[PDB]
Nucleic acid binder design. Structure first.
Ligand SMILES: [Zn+2]
Length: 125
RNA sequence: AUAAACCGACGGUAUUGUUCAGAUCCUGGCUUGCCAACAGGAGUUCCCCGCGCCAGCGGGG
């Protein structure tokens, strides 16, 4: 990578593309190895999205309707439905799959990271 | 001056040892190459040297 790639692409990043970077790292990226875990699907899951003429239409096409949403995710439950940052994960915890809310699952991040304090105005790398 | 630029897939290695292709076998029998025929007209025989020259005679190669 150091040999073949352009440097300074991670020098400075906008809030948007850092949110995107974070979500991507949480979902489709395989890092960081070591004492770091990926989830919930696993390492390098493949995403399949229906596409439309427009972004709006695309996002809406990939949304689950309320009855089917309820069907795929049986709310039964003892299910906590708060995100990783709202209600944190407990270390070494044994979490049953069915106990995860459809909210907690979609925005699940096991990375356990904080964004350092921002800086001023400039071009995003 | 291009997903470009700068840019080895690299180093190490017997395919080795043993082994008759052997024994039997006539290519045999029959066939004219025959018919015709002056070699004679011609003195050119290429190079030098000596002596002759209506002639030619010699000496070398
Ligand atoms: Zn940016």
């Amino acid at each position: 990578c150091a040999f073949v790639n352009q440097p300074g692409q991670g020098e400075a990043l906008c809030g948007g593309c850092t949110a995107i970077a974070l979500f991507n790292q949480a979902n489709q990226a395989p890092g960081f190895g070591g004492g770091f875990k990926s989830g919930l699907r696993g390492g390098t899951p493949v995403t399949t999205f229906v596409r439309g003429i427009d972004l709006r239409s695309t996002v809406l096409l990939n949304v689950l309707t309320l009855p089917r949403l309820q069907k795929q995710f049986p709310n039964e439950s003892h299910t906590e439905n708060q995100p990783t940052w709202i209600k944190p994960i407990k270390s070494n915890e044994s979490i049953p799959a069915s106990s995860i809310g459809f909210v907690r699952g979609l925005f699940w991040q096991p990375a356990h990271i904080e964004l350092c304090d921002p800086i001023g105005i400039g071009k995003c790398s």
